[PDB]
Amino acid sequence: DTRPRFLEQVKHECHFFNGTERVRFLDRYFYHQEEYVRFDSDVGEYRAVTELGRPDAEYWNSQKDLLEQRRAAVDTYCRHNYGVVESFTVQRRVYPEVTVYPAKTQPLQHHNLLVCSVNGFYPGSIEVRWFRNGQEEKTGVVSTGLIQNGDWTFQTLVMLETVPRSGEVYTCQVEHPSLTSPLTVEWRAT
Amino acid sequence: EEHVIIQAEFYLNPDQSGEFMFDFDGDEIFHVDMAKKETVWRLEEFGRFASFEAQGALANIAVDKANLEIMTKRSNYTPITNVPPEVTVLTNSPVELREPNVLICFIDKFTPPVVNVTWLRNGKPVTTGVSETVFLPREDHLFRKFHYLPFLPSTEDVYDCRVEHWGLDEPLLKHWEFDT
């Protein structure tokens, strides 16, 4: 199918700061990926973003009823919808499951990678740190970064490059809004 | 900002596909099944706390369709440039032999929002238990999408997520198999 495609998008956005204390509403129109016109509640009228949007900005701004609807949106739309969904979105907290397992950087070599797999958490904000015998190890640490699973949970793998010695205890420590104190998982060689 | 809630819509020609969804901080709250005219909550629990009149989405999509007509003409019929996806395959949880898990195929950073996705097990298409999301908006106004395959890990099976998109010269296969 080589037929040309044409895409229209609209995004009506509500931005919240300090609960609903400060709210900004953006009404955004796009042709393909190009935003062409927008209403910003900071401004209170539509403004063309590109030349393509100039006719709409002028036409829409001539409609006082439309403008008053948009000017009220921070209250009647944004604050309203925040109230409706906050209990299962804003307040959503799911604590991470934490697993540590050894791995190899190269097949022929002994285990020289410790993986801290942190799974199933919400929201995305998380801090993961490695410790060797109670001392934080900041070198040789690599991660997947924060991965969205698409189902209101996240995961991340945080790897420590190290050559484990007999007796050593490694600890992965996880901090997250769902937790009231750090979650730690130990791994001992062997 | 602490949080963002977006009502995101699109309409695509000539496919005549239109979508309507709400996003909270990058996750889908719900979308509207346009053909069934029903609200589909991303997690079933959401629908016990809130409602949405699906009919209202249809009216917006109709406006978006008419606006697309207008904008296509204004642009002198300039079409979209295909942007092919990045594809990653991962599991939901650490893999243990014969412990139920889920493969996730993450299809990201693409447009237009049309893709064919197939799960392959040992080179053969599999559909039992599969699921998928609608097209999800990105802040750069491209799209992303997730496909899922529950599975029982074994040394005997390999998997691939196969993705077809007009921006790709050939289908993209991303592999998964049990490590060590």
Binding site: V10, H12, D27, Y29, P55, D56, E58, Y59, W60, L66, Q69, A73, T76, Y77, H80, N81, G83, V84, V85 | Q7, E9, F22, I29, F30, F49, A50, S51, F52, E53, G56, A57, A59, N60, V63, D64, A66, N67, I70, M71
Partner: peptide
């Protein structure tokens, strides 16, 4: 409680 939509606006023809 009901989520409210924001209408999309017809452009100039």
């Amino acid at each position: 409680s009901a989520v409210r939509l924001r209408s999309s606006v017809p452009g100039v023809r």
